[PDB]
Structure formats: C-alpha cells, structure tokens
Amino acid sequence: AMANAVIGNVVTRFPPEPSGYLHVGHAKAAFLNNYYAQMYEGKMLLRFDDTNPVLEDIKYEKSIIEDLENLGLKYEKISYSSDHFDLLEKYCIDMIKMNKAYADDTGVEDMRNQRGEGIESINRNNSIEKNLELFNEMRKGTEIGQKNCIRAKINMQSKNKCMRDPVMYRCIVDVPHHKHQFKYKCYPTYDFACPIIDSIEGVTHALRTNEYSDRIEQYNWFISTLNLRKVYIYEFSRLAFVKTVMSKRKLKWFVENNVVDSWVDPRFPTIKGILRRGLTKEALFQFILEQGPSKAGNLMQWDKLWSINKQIIDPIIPRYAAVDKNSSILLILTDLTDQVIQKERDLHMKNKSLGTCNMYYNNKYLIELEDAQTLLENEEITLIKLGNIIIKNIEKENGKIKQINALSNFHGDFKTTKKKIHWLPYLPQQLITCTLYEYDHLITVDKFDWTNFINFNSKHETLVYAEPSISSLKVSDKFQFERRGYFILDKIDPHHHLHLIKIPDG
Ligand SMILES: [Cl-]
Numbered sequence: 001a002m003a004n005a006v007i008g009n010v011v012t013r014f015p016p017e018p019s020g021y022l023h024v025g026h027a028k029a030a031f032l033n034n035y036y037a038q039m040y041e042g043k044m045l046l047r048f049d050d051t052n053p054v055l056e057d058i059k060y061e062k063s064i065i066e067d068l069e070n071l072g073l074k075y076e077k078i079s080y081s082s083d084h085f086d087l088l089e090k091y092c093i094d095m096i097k098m099n100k101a102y103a104d105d106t107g108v109e110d111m112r113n114q115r116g117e118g119i120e121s122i123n124r125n126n127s128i129e130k131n132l133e134l135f136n137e138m139r140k141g142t143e144i145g146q147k148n149c150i151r152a153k154i155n156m157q158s159k160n161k162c163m164r165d166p167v168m169y170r171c172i173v174d175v176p177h178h179k180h181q182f183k184y185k186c187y188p189t190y191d192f193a194c195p196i197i198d199s200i201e202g203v204t205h206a207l208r209t210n211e212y213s214d215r216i217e218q219y220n221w222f223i224s225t226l227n228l229r230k231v232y233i234y235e236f237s238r239l240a241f242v243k244t245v246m247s248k249r250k251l252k253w254f255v256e257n258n259v260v261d262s263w264v265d266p267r268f269p270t271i272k273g274i275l276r277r278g279l280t281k282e283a284l285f286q287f288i289l290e291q292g293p294s295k296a297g298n299l300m301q302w303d304k305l306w307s308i309n310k311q312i313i314d315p316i317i318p319r320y321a322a323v324d325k326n327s328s329i330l331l332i333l334t335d336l337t338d339q340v341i342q343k344e345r346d347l348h349m350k351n352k353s354l355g356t357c358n359m360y361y362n363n364k365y366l367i368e369l370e371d372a373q374t375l376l377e378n379e380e381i382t383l384i385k386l387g388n389i390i391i392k393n394i395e396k397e398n399g400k401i402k403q404i405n406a407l408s409n410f411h412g413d414f415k416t417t418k419k420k421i422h423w424l425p426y427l428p429q430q431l432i433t434c435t436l437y438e439y440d441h442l443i444t445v446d447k448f449d450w451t452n453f454i455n456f457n458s459k460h461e462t463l464v465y466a467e468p469s470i471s472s473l474k475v476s477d478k479f480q481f482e483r484r485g486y487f488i489l490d491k492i493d494p495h496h497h498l499h500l501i502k503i504p505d506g
Pocket residue numbers: 167
C-alpha cells in the first residue's frame with residue numbers, strides 16, 4: 001500500500017539476503033517493490049540484507065543481479081545492510097543513553113520464558129553507564145561480551161510479543177562476516193537494523209511479507225524512539241506453491257544426492273530453474289497482480305500460473321511437428337513420386353507476423369504408432385497442413401505394424417474427415433533429432449523421514465524426430481509441437497541434437 005505516496009517521491013527497496021539464489025518467493029517481493037515504485041514515478045533500491053554473519057558457499061550477489069535483470073526489474077542503487085554497522089552502533093549507544101536499551105546476560109531459555117510470562121529481566125534497571133560498559137564488552141568480543149546481548153527497553157506487559165524487549169545487538173565471534181570477516185564482534189539484529197537503515201537510506205514505503213507477528217508496531221517504535229525520518233511499512237501476503245521444497249537444507253540434499261544436478265534444474269523453485277521450465281516473466285507478474293491476498297501458510301496451485309503463461313505464449317510462438325523416433329511408423333502414398341516437394345507455410349496460422357517456414361514432403365512419411373493403430377482400410381484422414389489421404393492397407397508383421405500404404409487425396413474436403421494427424425516427411429538426413437524432458441515435482445505432498453515423499457522418477461526423457469525447419473530455433477525459443485504441447489529449446493548439442501523442455505500448460 002502506498003499511504004500518502006507522492007508522485008515522483010516514492011522510494012521502495014527489495015532487500016534479499018545474499019546467501020542464496022533468488023526463488024519464486026523473492027519474486028512477489030521484487031515485483032511489488034518495482035510495481036509500486038513505477039506506479040508513483042519513484043525509485044527502487046536493491047539492498048543485500050547481510051546484517052548477520054553466515055557461512056556462504058558462494059557470493060550470490062552476481063546471480064541475484066542477473067535474475068533481477070531477467071525479470072526486467074531495475075533498481076537505482078545497490079547497498080548492503082552491513083554498510084551501516086557503525087551508524088547502527090552509534091544508534092545503539094543513543095538508545096542506551098536515553099534509557100531505551102539495556103544489556104542482558106540472561107540465558108536463552110530463561111529469556112524466552114520471561115518474555116512469555118512478561119516478567120522483567122534483572123538487568124532491565126541496569127544503569128546507563130553499566131549498559132554502556134557491557135555494550136563495549138560486546139563490541140570488543142570478550143568472554144563477558146559473548147554472554148551479553150542488547151535489548152530494547154519497551155514494554156514487557158505488552159499484548160504484542162514483539163514489544164517485550166526485542167534483542168537489538170548480539171555478540172558473534174566465531175563465524176566471519178562475508179564482507180568484514182572478524183572486524184565486527186557484535187551485530188545488530190534484523191528487527192533493529194531494518195527500520196533505521198530504511199529511514200537513513202531514504203525509503204518512503206517499506207514492503208514486507210506478513211510474518212503474522214505485529215512487527216510493524218515495533219518497527220515504528222524504533223523510528224519514533226530515535227526521532228528518525230518516518231517510513232511507511234506495509235505487509236503483503238507470501239507467495240508459496242504446493243509440492244515445492246523451499247528449505248535450503250533439503251534443496252542442497254537434492255543437489256548432493258544427485259536427484260538433480262544443479263540449482264538451475266527445472267524442478268527447483270529458483271528463478272533460473274523456472275524460467276528454464278518455460279515461465280514468462282509476464283505470466284509471473286500477471287499471476288501476482290491477479291492472485292489476491294492469502295491467509296497464513298496457504299499454498300498456491302501451479303495450474304493458474306501455467307494457464308496464464310499458456311494464454312500469453314500461445315499466440316506468439318511458432319508451431320512444428322515431431323514424432324517418436326524409435327516407434328514411428330512409415331506411411332507410403334503409393335500414387336506419388338519420391339521427388340521432394342517444398343511449400344511455404346506460416347509459422348503460425350493466426351499470426352503471419354512470425355513469418356514463414358518450409359514444408360518438405362515425399363511419397364514417404366512418418367506417423368505416430370498410436371495414430372497408425374487407429375487407422376483401418378479405406379479411411380479418409382487429414383495430414384495436417386498437407387491434405388486428406390485414404391488409407392489402403394496396414395502391413396503388420398507379427399503384430400508390430402511395419403508399414404501403412406495409402407493414397408494421396410489432397411484436394412478432398414478437409415472438413416469431411418474427423419481424424420487429423422501430424423506427420424514428418426521421411427527424410428532422415430534432414431530430420432532433427434531431439435530429446436524431450438517432461439518434468440514433475442520433486443515431492444509428492446503439498447507440504448511436510450521426508451525422503452519418503454521424494455519423486456526420484458521426476459525427469460522423463462524421450463527421443464523424437466522433428467521437422468527440419470526447427471533447425472532455425474535458437475536457445476530459449478518457445479514453440480508448440482502439434483498435438484504434443486508447449487516446449488522451450490534448452491540446449492543445442494553437437495550435430496544439432498536439440499534438448500527441449502516441455503512447458504506445463506495447466
Ligand atoms: Cl530472541
């Protein structure tokens with residue numbers, strides 16, 4: 001929401017942590033921050049949220065940047081939360097001097113329980129000078145410092161759990177920070193860092209997933225307690241899908257146990273994986289704008305997303321033909337010659353804009369086995385884009401159909417017939433060999449021994465022959481295979497062997 005937004009003067013920010021790849025969850029946040037900045041002719045910041053040290057097997061900044069670019073989302077400037085550590089320490093000391101923060105040595109358990117029943121910690125009435133001595137203990141990372149945290153002094157009997165003295169600063173000496181190594185011994189918490197950094201970076205409208213705690217009241221308290229320029233904060237609903245593993249632990253488990261080969265595998269929820277699967281950014285954003293709110297912990301179905309994507313791509317992608325390579329059946333039109341005839345057709349029967357292709361045909365054709373099995377003698381069918389034929393005799397040898405002889409009747413009425421089938425010309429030196437990948441979800445349950453619900457058999461490969469014209473497609477082109485479905489060209493192997501990912505269609 002854009003409470004009191006001023007045209008030309010809105011600043012939003014997308015703040016992903018830099019210890020992982022962007023995934024579809026991130027997408028709603030990135031999109032809404034851009035949608036509202038553009039609505040008000042404002043700007044969107046990119047901020048890498050690195051307030052606390054992590055052990056990162058990579059610097060994900062570059063991948064996050066390129067995913068944002070691939071979604072069309074541009075940002076005015078890039079910052080890191082850790083850019084503001086010194087300022088945040090300043091503000092922590094300010095808090096301490098106004099008696100709005102104190103140092104607490106209480107253990108984890110005792111502190112959680114105290115907060116539950118609303119009893120004030122023994123240290124809540126520590127003196128300002130003592131709180132400062134202990135904060136400096138934390139700053140230098142001494143034995144005493146590592147036993148202390150800084151907490152906000154708010155209201156322990158508040159109805160809101162987030163207002164009962166939330167931690168502001170922790171002392172962490174063992175894990176190094178990806179930017180500052182061990183230069184910092186204490187680190188601000190997310191709850192403290194977030195409002196201050198928003199105010200001092202010039203954010204006007206902070207957007208955030210609803211975490212179903214009233215963190216908004218606490219955020220505002222920090223801004224008002226410290227007398228900072230005010231920031232509006234609004235919480236939207238999280239985007240999460242059924243049958244989708246988001247736990248980083250389980251995702252790396254997949255990678256390491258060779259269920260998938262990389263984090264870009266098309267079954268992964270990463271932005272790259274799902275674009276590899278054939279989703280358009282236009283579909284993602286339209287789905288987001290149209291989905292409406294969702295309540296706590298609800299999970300979307302994939303069907304409306306892939307149906308929107310289908311409606312988008314159907315009118316602007318070319319159509320080709322493909323048959324099963326190993327089980328295709330030879331069809332002979334015994335009235336024609338083996339002279340190869342070549343005729344121009346539209347790549348799209350309703351969109352001459354995408355242009356023309358060349359169609360080759362012969363006396364000899366390949367058709368699908370399941371199509372051959374339905375044919376019987378003196379049946380008038382239609383070879384799509386070519387014309388009617390009349391089947392003559394099905395030459396079956398020991399049950400396995402081996403041949404079908406027919407006769408051209410191309411000038412017959414293509415409406416009379418009810419069987420319309422796709423075909424390839426039998427020109428093996430020109431047909432394109434392709435591998436087709438039909439993917440399925442990595443787990444079988446909508447949500448969570450979990451290894452018991454992994455679909456290890458979720459990458460189905462099949463080998464096909466495709467029409468020659470498909471040679472013109474470049475990597476990441478999307479298209480339709482007649483009577484088969486929607487596909488995206490993923491890779492061109494040696495000898496122009498194509499690797500094609502079936503796009504879910506809903
Ligand atoms: Cl805590």
